[PDB]
Design an enzyme around this catalytic site. Structure first.
Site, PDB file in Angstrom:
ATOM      1  N   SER A  60       0.632  -1.694   0.142  1.00  0.00           N
ATOM      2  CA  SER A  60       0.153   0.075   0.126  1.00  0.00           C
ATOM      3  C   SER A  60       1.407   1.339   0.118  1.00  0.00           C
ATOM      4  CB  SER A  60      -1.164   0.299   0.779  1.00  0.00           C
ATOM      5  OG  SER A  60      -2.155  -0.668   1.306  1.00  0.00           O
ATOM      6  N   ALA A 119     -10.780 -13.023   3.994  1.00  0.00           N
ATOM      7  CA  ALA A 119     -11.158 -13.439   4.981  1.00  0.00           C
ATOM      8  C   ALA A 119     -10.658 -14.419   5.361  1.00  0.00           C
ATOM      9  CB  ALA A 119     -12.277 -14.113   4.577  1.00  0.00           C
ATOM     10  N   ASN A 159      -9.057  -0.011   0.025  1.00  0.00           N
ATOM     11  CA  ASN A 159      -7.977  -1.192  -1.055  1.00  0.00           C
ATOM     12  C   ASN A 159      -8.903   0.145  -2.254  1.00  0.00           C
ATOM     13  OD1 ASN A 159      -5.788  -1.464  -1.208  1.00  0.00           O
ATOM     14  ND2 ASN A 159      -7.176  -2.683   0.397  1.00  0.00           N
ATOM     15  N   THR A 297       2.452   3.027   4.662  1.00  0.00           N
ATOM     16  CA  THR A 297       2.666   1.378   5.604  1.00  0.00           C
ATOM     17  C   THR A 297       2.181   0.603   4.351  1.00  0.00           C
ATOM     18  OG1 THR A 297       1.073   1.097   6.733  1.00  0.00           O
ATOM     19  CG2 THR A 297       2.789   2.193   7.743  1.00  0.00           C
TER      20      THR A 297
END
Length: 345
Positions: A60, A119, A159, A297
């Site tokens: 990211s 998940a 995102n 980060t």
């Protein structure tokens, strides 16, 4: 600033290894004096040592590259931060009150599609790692869920916001995001270790392998080095190095990558928690000694990145551990910012 604390940095890396990172490393550019430390392995099956020149997936942190390109479009008059996203991408989103500034600061309400995907950690990686998605495919996945808040109303990292960012760059420029990254950032800063190769799965040149931690305690690590990162693209697929991310955040904060006006918009902080903020594709972290640092980060399978600089860009720090799905290691690696900026206790 206090002097960076290399013994503290050494302890941080050693702790990350004791917690399951195969390798961990950090590079500080202290106003032209370098600190570089690494411990452990780039490849756990062959034993090859990790080193601060190894390339890796920044996850990211890509969002800051995307945001620099969008803010340069703002400087060029091609983008207005307070215009609707749908003004530029007609009918993309269900609500025209969702604006570009709300997307870039995670205030849009758009559901994060990656919560469907991951998940279960290793099954979700095995699902996406060899898929190629269009931007629109990922937006459609988000839009199967309703929004999570009214436009602008709440910080909710997603995102999806930086998938929209990539669609906006490509629509407004008529070029691929790889081309825009290259022309507006990688070439001008001579980021020779920095790439955007999506959907290729190879990391060019010598790199750290990534080791995904399974959900089962004690389970064998999974080599996650080679994947398309197509589920993230302009939200997560850049490859770089500790030197190049230091260069990049130093250039950003010292004012080299956009007008002063737009950097000021980038640093308009939305509260994330009591020690963090989010601007426009940019994080603020407040450190214990009363200093704040600026950067981003990343978490991508097998790799945790921290890349932050001081307000004037004069000290920059990038830390990497080549594991993920390991919150002990994630939390330990944050401590490199305390040792590198706050120095010895």
């Amino acid at each position: 600033l206090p002097a960076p604390d290399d013994t503290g940095l050494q302890a941080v890396l050693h702790t990350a290894l004791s917690q399951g990172a195969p390798g961990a490393m950090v590079r500080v550019d202290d106003n032209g004096t370098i600190h570089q430390l690494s411990e452990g392995v780039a490849d756990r099956a062959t034993g090859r040592a990790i080193t601060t020149t190894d390339r890796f997936r920044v996850g990211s942190v890509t969002k800051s590259f995307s945001a620099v390109v969008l803010l340069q479009l703002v400087d060029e008059g091609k983008l207005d931060l307070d215009a609707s996203v749908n003004t530029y991408l007609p009918g993309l989103l269900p609500d025209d009150r969702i604006t570009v500034r709300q997307v870039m600061s995670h205030r849009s309400g758009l559901y994060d599609y990656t919560n469907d995907m991951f998940a279960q950690t290793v099954p979700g990686f095995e699902s996406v790692r060899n898929k190629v998605f269009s931007y629109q495919d990922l937006i459609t996945l988000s839009l199967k869920h309703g929004v999570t808040n009214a436009p602008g109303a709440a910080y909710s990292y997603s995102n999806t916001n930086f998938v929209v960012a990539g669609m906006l760059i490509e629509k407004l420029t008529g070029h691929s995001v790889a081309t825009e990254y290259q022309n507006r950032i990688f070439t001008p800063l001579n980021l020779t270790d920095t790439f955007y190769v999506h959907p290729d799965t190879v990391i060019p040149g010598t790199h750290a392998n990534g080791y995904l931690t399974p959900d089962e305690a004690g389970g064998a690590l999974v080599d996650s080095t080679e994947q398309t990162v197509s589920w993230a693209q302009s939200a997560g697929a850049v490859i770089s190095s500790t030197q190049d991310l230091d260069t990049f955040f130093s250039a950003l904060m010292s004012g080299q990558l956009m007008s002063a006006a737009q950097l000021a918009q980038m640093q308009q902080w939305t509260t994330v928690n009591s020690t963090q903020g989010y601007g426009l594709g940019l994080r603020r972290r407040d450190l214990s000694c009363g200093i704040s640092v600026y950067g981003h980060t990343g978490t991508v399978q097998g790799y945790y990145t921290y890349a932050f600089a001081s307000k004037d860009g004069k000290r920059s720090v990038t830390a990497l551990a080549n594991t993920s799905n390991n919150v002990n290691v994630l939390n330990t690696m944050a401590r490199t910012l305390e040792s590198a900026f706050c120095g010895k206790p």
